[model samples]
Target chain A: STAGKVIKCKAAVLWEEKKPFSIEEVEVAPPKAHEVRIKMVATGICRSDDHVVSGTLVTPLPVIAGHEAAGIVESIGEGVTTVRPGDKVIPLFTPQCGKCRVCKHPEGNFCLKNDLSMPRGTMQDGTSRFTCRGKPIHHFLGTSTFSQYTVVDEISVAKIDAASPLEKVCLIGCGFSTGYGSAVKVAKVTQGSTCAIFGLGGVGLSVIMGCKAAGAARIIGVDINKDKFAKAKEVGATECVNPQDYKKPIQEVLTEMSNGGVDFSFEVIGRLDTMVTALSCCQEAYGVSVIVGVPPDSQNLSMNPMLLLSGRTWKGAIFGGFKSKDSVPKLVADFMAKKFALDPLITHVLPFEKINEGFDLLRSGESIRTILTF
Target chain B: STAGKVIKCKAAVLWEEKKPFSIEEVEVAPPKAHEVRIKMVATGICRSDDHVVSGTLVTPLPVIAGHEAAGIVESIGEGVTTVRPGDKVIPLFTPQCGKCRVCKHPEGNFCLKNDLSMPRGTMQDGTSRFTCRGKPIHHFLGTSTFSQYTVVDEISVAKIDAASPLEKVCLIGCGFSTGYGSAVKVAKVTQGSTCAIFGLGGVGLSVIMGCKAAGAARIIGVDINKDKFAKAKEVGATECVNPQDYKKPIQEVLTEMSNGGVDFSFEVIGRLDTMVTALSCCQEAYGVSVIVGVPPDSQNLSMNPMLLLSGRTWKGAIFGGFKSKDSVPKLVADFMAKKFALDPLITHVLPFEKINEGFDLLRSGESIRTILTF
Candidate 1:
């Protein structure tokens, strides 16, 4: 059992899609063999979780929502060796077993074992750990950090130094990983290369940070929100554009800025228009554009045949190609080393009771990321 | 000056698209600075020139047709040191000018000089060497090989040992180079990887030959003609399927045969429907499909977002990324070495006098490639 922690706790629950989250009282379960139970202190609300709410993702209903989180380990499952009950952790949307082929390869982003277990919606042993009214509740992204305590596979969890701030580290789970990994792992933005990012949201700004880390000479941020332009610059955007101005040909502007189009363009908006614009603005030859955005339901994109013939490349970057168990601790260490920026990305924190209001703020577009503190 | 015998010759001219070919007399100009005057012998009828005849490719009227040719150098342009007089040579559609940045770099395909000069329909200097009744007629693809004798930039001439058949080697100038280069240079076909070639026509079959040369494990050929199945297998196709068998989801059939999906796919059909199918059934994360066919003027393509997100890539293979001058000789060397099949792909040979009949046979779908011997 984890020492220096209360035995019982409160957690919010979602009963169904488009339904209000219901409060629930439940007993925390101890860890099983190769499993660890996290004593969740803070978890960030991510847009992907909203996909679960909007019924776009088709995940099991009435589950705890948050996936981007950081907390202390409450207990360990039987034979669990990766992390102890008191270890600090960041919840991973996609877990890494480190034994899978993708984890071992330098180029692959999709891990087979722990990452592909999403459709099953249970622990590695094919059983749910969370209980509601003596019935099992599904685990969300294998972490279920929306709960005060959630059990997860030990190999799926990484141990970070306890000294780091849980509130800041929590954003590293999905948003930061998705954005940072898109730049560092997928696009491989080189030094002196021109980079353009569509959508200056949390992920886009972090992509700007990642581009800065990669040594991109020019980082152009595209967004309709004029307010975010200054903020985009603060995060490393060298230039910013509004889609409404010269909306006819963004490619021409980008190409002009980049001295014949940007070498690498990133898509974070997920709209068909944004996706095409993201692709068309690449340099004439050997330019690569990466898509990190998730599109809305039932949208299609079309491209002129001539665009691809000129030697440009387009690819999708999933979950920023991050491996939870493998990269989380390393990123946290990097954060400790001041190699990354996390504190600025996490704008606000609220108590558990204000989460519904926090969701409203997220809907109104006031907050980039909202963390619920227990 | 070339030591070989120089003879005044004739050339086929296109007065306009949708009109009959015009036989005309032209002065055989001696090679100028960095140029070679070729005593043309044989030329291949390529579909790229058909685009001009079909009015799909808008060009200047009254043009000399044909880019694929093999000849003996009758004379050399001043400051030209690469090839001497009386050397066996091939006409290149696009000059690599190895001194250009793209020719110097491993990945650069579209050289700035070539890109800038192609659309103007004239040589670097504002003049056409080919004329009918002393009226300037545009040169097609720089070579204008329908002429019994023609002058070209020295970089456009690839000298090969005189042992190989000129008619067979001429196919390497356009058809073989386009197909083989698409597979070898552009796609960089992997050894033991599975590939699918859509349309078992000349270019498609050449892709099969290229695949075989690249040591591809599975080569699937899809075409409307089941009659071409035997011919495809003779070239290199491991599995052949007709469009009649696959009403829909042809990718599924090919992917099932390929043990999941092909690593590389080629769409030589130039139709939007088959091109869409070619993009499908490709292994995501690494599978690349190239569009080598030039579609009709009215044809456009729709791309589903998931196709790219799933890792299936689509790009146009411009001359298979062949930098004419640098690639033509290597292609000829491979053909001479018997490393790739060439002569078998040339199904028919017609005299330059029957050039219109050659186009008729190409339109009739009876011949793979009909070479016009001058």
Candidate 2:
């Protein structure tokens, strides 16, 4: 049953920053107390994973990279009460230890177990759950779904609908859920509002889809690459603009197009400059700008205080402000009900062995989401 | 009646930045179309006025620097319809042209015809109303109440109750209303929440009062000057802290005090360094940091995006998100209802001729708010 025993499986491990993922065999141990072992069914190659490879988002290396994933529970350790063996589940990068101060807080979604700021990349006991060539391989974001077999804390597991398809719904674990919740929950996108989305990637397109569902009147997609426009428009963008095409800044262009400025704007591109443009593109008085992209560690966003002082809200949230354990299953249920489509977001589907090729397509801006099937 | 004619009156005129306001005789001309001439009764010596002297907040040179004031409309221009002669009113720095796109916006209060971005310091017709030595004196923030009489656009006047006293309520035009509205309206301070306010000036005290009124249980006043702490606590702050008392960064000290950062924080000092500290001191997941202070020009706040990325909301608003023409009258009514106190915010009252001394008191932190009576 692959339970209570070590399983040797394939995994894409990143040796370090500026290095490609090495597809090799790794040994995954059984779940520890309050932990659950999961067999990965499908995983999406998210920019966050690329961030580890590129050094924008720093984490310990020789680690499994994927986090946007759906899998099946293979085994559960003692004291684990949430998920059982053979349950369809999503691995959450943001865990929910219900008794922790953050978990008990009504507005807080960041769990005490998160390693985002001061990352360890190790398990709760400060040790590795994985080994390659008899050497320890660290974790990434605590989920480590790049491996075929991975173990996460019980608090980081959410059981989904049994009938849910693994390939498409895998996106629900990250990008789709993140963007949708950002529009619906974080920004609280109002009806008949104007919205502008920067960087027509998977997350940005998901944001457009969210804006449409939230009843946004105008969904304008902004990108440096115009080729992503067609796909972006298909998702929900009413129009698209390339900043290179205009002599003026894109904020001015969008401001002119929207008559004054957009009600909401999102920067899905992690670049600092784009974040400024997104904030400025929103209306001065009551506009809300959300930063969905995670920028590099050392780079800082510099802007005049008047940009916010004049009445603009700038906020960002991990997991789109969603409480992972509490909200992920509901999001999956909504997907099961056909409330939204995740198929259009999938531009390429590759075998697990072609993980490097999937990342290359993402780096080149040739794909929206590249789901790797095991 | 001083109507339909030029009136000679004394005004505190600022020749340029880094210079003192010189009290001199100036000729106040009749109101133009869509404007009103108001005989200033009382004006507060605000930090914004001192900003011109310190070169932090920039406007045109040779300008009258006061904005927080209450007065009586002595005359009305051709198209003025909101107020009549002899009506008590508060002049708005941020005008509310109901016909403009921003004004019509449900959430927007910034009028399209604002000098915030571009500085003309003149009327809509591109002419000055105050002339000292036959040389036109520029306006500051449209409502240059430093003069005994000033002309403002009809859109910049909010008619208050006839029984409203102009002396204490002058703070309503800016500091009191700005800070109060920030707590009650902008941040929407919740019951039993914790707040940290930087700068224990008139506006900061008002913020504390508003927070108390909104059922805030733990209001912490943060200031460099320990002398301001008593007034801060008297207003509503549960406790007060002097950053100089601690060895570490104020944010870390605050985080430790609040058990993980406060729910709401404010930067009332308008210093860029303090703004970053405020943003960092708030709880990562749901804490909101509001910027109330206006920073210096040619300077930008630089912060790592991860501060906002990990579920923090950073926002700012002018006049605390109060729609000038629409909300000011209501705020005055609230003041009359004894919903809040303004008397406590005023520490000194002086003749208009002592405007320079009043500014000095504010600069030296000897006064909370000094009301200059004409």
Candidate 3:
């Protein structure tokens, strides 16, 4: 059993921002109290990881930088009762510490004890579990799925259906769930409503799929890259527009196309300009826009309040507003039921040793999602 | 009836920005097609009117500036079908131009053909109906009820119960509807929830009244003036906190008092800084903050998206999300049915001749609402 022991495993570590990921043999420590050690089977390349590398979203460095993944529980720490050894589980970037005020509330999924807020890159006890070259390495988003083995807080693990294929359901940990739930859960997109998704990444395409599943009358995908159009349409975008081709602002074009603005809009692109455009592209009255992507850190979005006063709603979602530990397993079960297909989003596959190459595929926009296997 | 004829009436005309409204004899033209001429009985001096007087919210000057009013339909133009001569009505500042997209929308009251959007100082035909000293005088909010006789579009007049008092229901035109509707309709403040309302004007007091009626367990009225606290508690606020009394930022102070932020917060003063404060004061998980007051024109609200990304919703409402024509009459009927009282909001009443003095009282924070009787 790989329990009560330290496991030396391969992980892609970023020593600093703007540097390439270097695969290194890292020491994964045993699970502490209220924690679990997991053997990651598959992890997905996501924009959030790239954001940290690009210094767009600020975080401590020399860290294992992947969050979206599915793994098997290898060991459980003292007092940990939720998931046992051999249980298949998803690592939640957005945790659900049930004792927190947000977790206790019925309406929101933001756990106060989250990595995004305070003391990130460490465990609940503010300690790192991974080490490289005799130096303790920081954790990314508390999951650190980039490593072959990782230790996570007990609350951040969602034990899923045994039948779930980790290669595909790994996306359900972040991209798939974020975009999909943003439509159905966050915006609560109404049937026959018009929706506009700004960005054609894996998350954006998933949003289109969600829109289609939610019975949207029109799904307009917006992106600067014209090459992303074909995939966007395949994933249920009724139409696709390149903002570069338009003479006017994207909002005006979408407004005219939707017969005076879409009922619901989403910014899957992590930019303040697109966020404001998505907010503006929605109908002034009764239109809702959701920020599905995290923008640059410490950046402020400046806009007139009149845009909202005229009867518009602007909000953001984390992990698509899902209570991670509770919803991720359900999402996995839903995927197993053939309710929605995740196959359309998978574009490339690579071994964990080629993690940098997977990131390259992501960088050139050549792939929607690249799943890296252990 | 003053039909098919020109009528002379007394009006308070704002000649320039940052200038007091001067009492003058103005010529009132007969209503055009699809319009109704109203003999103003009472009007409430609102913050919007004061904003115009202070040049905060920019609009064309040499205008009659009042939107909250109750009056008798003196006459109707050709093709006007909603209300007839002698009908008791509340003139809607936010009209229901039923042909436009927003008017067709179920959830919002903002009409596409709104004064805030287009040629604001005139009627739909792009001409002023009132003139002073042989110069054309502009309309304010499409219902310039500062004049003794004002012509409003047929859609902008809500025919209320005939027995309703004009002096009281005039507040229903803007202040009462904007505040009360925000709680029950826009934010849909849940029972046993906590609420923080910024700015303690007539609209703010009305919001306290609404939160109480909505069964909110804790209503926290936040204002710079401690004097407004007693009246706030009288209107059903369980606790009233003065922002100036605390050394910490108002949001931090309120967050501590509410044991981790309020469930719903409202900004009723139309200031950008206060708007941001209210957004921050609400719970980051499920707390919703509504921009109840209109901010300065062209001024931007700059904030970090992290505030929203944690599952907080930011939205704004006009006329408290009421679809003006359809909802106003119902609100009046509810008022007549003793569902709520408007007496607490009206702190002073003045003759039209003392209009400037009423504004002074409002500026001095000595008045909740100062109704001007013609």
lDDT of 3 at A40: 93
* Recovered fraction of real interface contacts per model: 0.48, 0.91, 0.93
Pairs with backbone N, CA or C atoms under 3 Å apart (clashes), candidate 1: A31-A77, A32-A77, A32-A78, A255-A261, B32-B77
For residues B42-87, write the lDDT of model 3, one tens digit per residue: 9999988998898787888889999999999999999988899989
Q: Candidate 2 local accuracy as lDDT?
A: 0.90
What DockQ does every candidate get?
0.44, 0.82, 0.87
Candidate 2, B284-331: lDDT as tens digits: 988999999989887998888889888899999888888899999998
Off by over 4 Å in 2: none
Docking class of 1: acceptable
Ranking of predictions according to DockQ:
3, 2, 1
Candidate with the larger DockQ of 2 and 3: 3
Report the Cα RMSD per candidate: 4.1, 1.3, 1.3
By lDDT, is 1 or 2 better?
2
Winner by lDDT: 3
Q: What TM value does model 1 have?
A: 0.86
Q: What are the lDDT scores of the predictions, listed in order? A: 0.77, 0.90, 0.90
**What TM-score against the true chain A does chain A of each candidate get?**
0.92, 0.98, 0.98
